[PDB]
Ligand binder design. Structure first.
Ligand SMILES: [Zn+2]
Ligand SMILES: [Zn+2]
Ligand SMILES: [Zn+2]
Ligand SMILES: [Zn+2]
Ligand SMILES: [Zn+2]
Ligand SMILES: [Zn+2]
Ligand SMILES: [Zn+2]
Ligand SMILES: [Zn+2]
Length: 306
């Protein structure tokens, strides 16, 4: 199976999963929108009304397509959709991770000039450590994010749902970043438990903080916001863009094809996998990747790839 789409399934998976691409008529919201041409890039499927087609519904004048993704690891209800993480891709070229140098798949590809790749395990740890060490980067109109681990310019992540990889608890803290930052500069602490989130003012010398008007019954550590513990916090936290240059050089992500049936040269349209044979005696519609004739599986798994 060739998966070009990856989503974050909030439930029941609570992880990054291969996604199924779907389209419907934006007017009647039925799966009857036949595309004049297929999507060739992420903008085609993420930007409203980018693409046009024909609705096959009886009395619907619909022209515009509406794309959405669903987790493919299990049955999903009609409106059980998931957010697409376009920075994540199959590691078909077997690029090594910029941090651990392991060959993993899928990987996250930063938008930096070098297009450094990083495995999801390492990206998870990267986000977790920056979150705990309060080292997220503030962008005025976007919020809080992180650039490439190599600190490359113009690599700041714009689709903030990528930080869902923090895990559900840590992601909740990430959503409180501005508020917690204000409480911290004040010499205070923010209760880590989602249902509470009370602002607390502990003793400046005390490291244990009790959520005690009305708080909750939770004693936690001031430095790692975890349930209070003896001695040192996690070694990854008290350990505070130093990247191995050779590992970073390795970790970089770097037109027609004959019709499978009649072998006439067919032109590819951008990253779209849908190929349409021009030969009037053939006119095969086929997948650039699979070499088979076009079908719903190729549509859902890899309508396009970039
Ligand atoms: Zn799922
Ligand atoms: Zn319609
Ligand atoms: Zn890694
Ligand atoms: Zn980079
Ligand atoms: Zn609390
Ligand atoms: Zn701690
Ligand atoms: Zn042909
Ligand atoms: Zn295919």
């Amino acid at each position: 199976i060739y998966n070009s789409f990856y989503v974050y399934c909030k439930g029941p998976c609570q992880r990054v999963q291969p996604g199924k691409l779907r389209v419907q008529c934006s007017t009647c919201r039925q799966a009857t929108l036949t595309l004049t041409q297929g999507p060739s890039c992420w903008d085609d499927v993420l930007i409203p009304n980018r693409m046009s087609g024909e609705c096959q519904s009886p009395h619907c004048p619909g022209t515009s397509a509406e794309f959405f993704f669903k987790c493919g690891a299990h049955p999903t209800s009609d409106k059980e959709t998931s957010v697409a993480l376009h920075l994540i891709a199959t590691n078909s070229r077997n690029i090594t991770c910029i941090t651990c140098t392991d060959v993993r798949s899928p990987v996250l590809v930063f938008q930096c000039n070098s297009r450094h790749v990083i495995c999801l395990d390492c990206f998870h740890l990267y986000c977790v450590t920056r979150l705990n060490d309060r080292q997220f980067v503030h962008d005025p109109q976007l919020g809080y994010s992180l650039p490439c681990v190599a600190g490359c310019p113009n690599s700041l992540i714009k689709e903030l749902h990528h930080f869902r990889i923090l895990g559900e608890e840590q992601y909740n803290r990430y959503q409180q970043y501005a508020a917690e930052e204000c409480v911290l500069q004040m010499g205070g602490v923010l209760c880590p438990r989602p249902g509470c989130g009370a602002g607390l003012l502990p003793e400046p010398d005390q490291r244990k903080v009790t959520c005690e008007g009305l708080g909750c019954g939770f004693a936690f550590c001031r430095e790692c916001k975890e349930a209070y513990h003896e001695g040192e916090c996690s070694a990854v936290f008290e350990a505070s863009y130093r990247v191995d240059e050779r590992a970073a050089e390795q970790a970089r992500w770097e037109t027609t094809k004959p019709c499978p049936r009649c072998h006439v040269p067919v032109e590819k349209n951008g990253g779209c996998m849908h190929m349409k044979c021009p030969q009037p005696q053939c006119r095969l519609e086929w997948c650039w990747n699979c070499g088979c004739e076009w079908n719903r599986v190729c549509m859902g798994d890899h309508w396009f790839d970039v």
